[PDB]
Design a protein around this ligand. Structure first.
Ligand SMILES: Nc1ncnc2c1ncn2[C@@H]1O[C@H](CSCC[C@H](N)C(=O)O)[C@@H](O)[C@H]1O
Ligand SMILES: Oc1cc(-c2ccc(F)cc2)cc2cncnc12
Ligand SMILES: [Cl-]
Ligand SMILES: [Cl-]
Ligand SMILES: [Mg+2]
Length: 213
């Protein structure tokens, strides 16, 4: 078995079904005590939670699901009827994510789209009936942050006030994205310094608010 399979099994055996908080705790504990994994983690998770509660987004897009940690984290704070779409290129992780969401009881709030973000983003309007996004969590490969942001704008998916929240802007880092949004009059940016998940290593999130053309 894989590390991802072991994470899911641990959750199933150490958290309570339908209790998102106990799922996060179980993942955090396994990844602290047993095997590191690239979940956004509790340190940065807490800053995400603060952002989510500030904006109360009705429709969130996540880029990069992995084992579903962040999707559980965001979905648990969504208001009734509010939705998350999460894109995941690896089918094994998409399957882990779905199972994680099911265990947590958040499956009716989340749709996991198995495919590349660059292929799926142009389908959101027609195929998934999206108008505009309220928030986007960028947490997939770091070289896609900038191209996918520009694609989101091209496809008419951003509106005035759409909140981009980007993980890992320090480690591994996303230099082209960071310099772009910070230099653009189309974004209002704020940096939230934190720590790499499960490590004493500085990391941070960037919040970039779309201001229109
Ligand atoms: N272009 C792409 N489109 C969709 N998913 C991608 C991608 N490039 C990478 N990924 C996926 O992005 C993930 C990054 S890890 C995501 C962790 C998750 N947000 C959390 O905090 O819990 C991996 O599962 C990887 O397969
Ligand atoms: O949060 C993350 C962390 C790391 C990562 C890996 C190795 C390392 F040494 C440090 C950090 C990689 C990621 C890829 N996609 C999404 N999120 C990531
Ligand atoms: Cl990467
Ligand atoms: Cl952490
Ligand atoms: Mg990350």
């Amino acid at each position: 078995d894989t590390k991802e399979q072991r994470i899911l099994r641990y959750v199933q055996q150490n958290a309570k079904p339908g209790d998102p908080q106990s799922v996060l705790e179980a993942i955090d504990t396994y990844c602290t005590q047993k095997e590191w994994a690239m979940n956004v983690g509790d340190a940065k998770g807490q800053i995400m939670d603060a952002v989510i509660r500030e904006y109360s987004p009705s429709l969130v897009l996540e880029l990069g699901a992995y084992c579903g940690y962040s999707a559980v984290r965001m979905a648990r704070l969504l208001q009734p009827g509010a939705r998350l779409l999460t894109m995941e290129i690896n089918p094994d992780c998409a399957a882990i994510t779905q199972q994680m969401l099911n265990f947590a009881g958040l499956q009716d709030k989340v749709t996991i789209l198995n495919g590349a973000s660059q292929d799926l983003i142009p389908q959101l309007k027609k195929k998934y009936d999206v108008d505009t996004l309220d928030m986007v969590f960028l947490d997939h490969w770091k070289d896609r942050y900038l191209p996918d942001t520009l694609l989101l704008e091209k496809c008419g998916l951003l509106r005035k006030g759409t909140v981009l929240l980007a993980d890992n802007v320090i480690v591994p880092g996303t230099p082209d994205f960071l310099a772009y949004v910070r230099g653009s009059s189309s974004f209002e940016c704020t940096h939230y310094s934190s720590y790499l998940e499960y490590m004493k290593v500085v990391d941070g999130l960037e919040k970039a608010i779309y201001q229109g053309p």
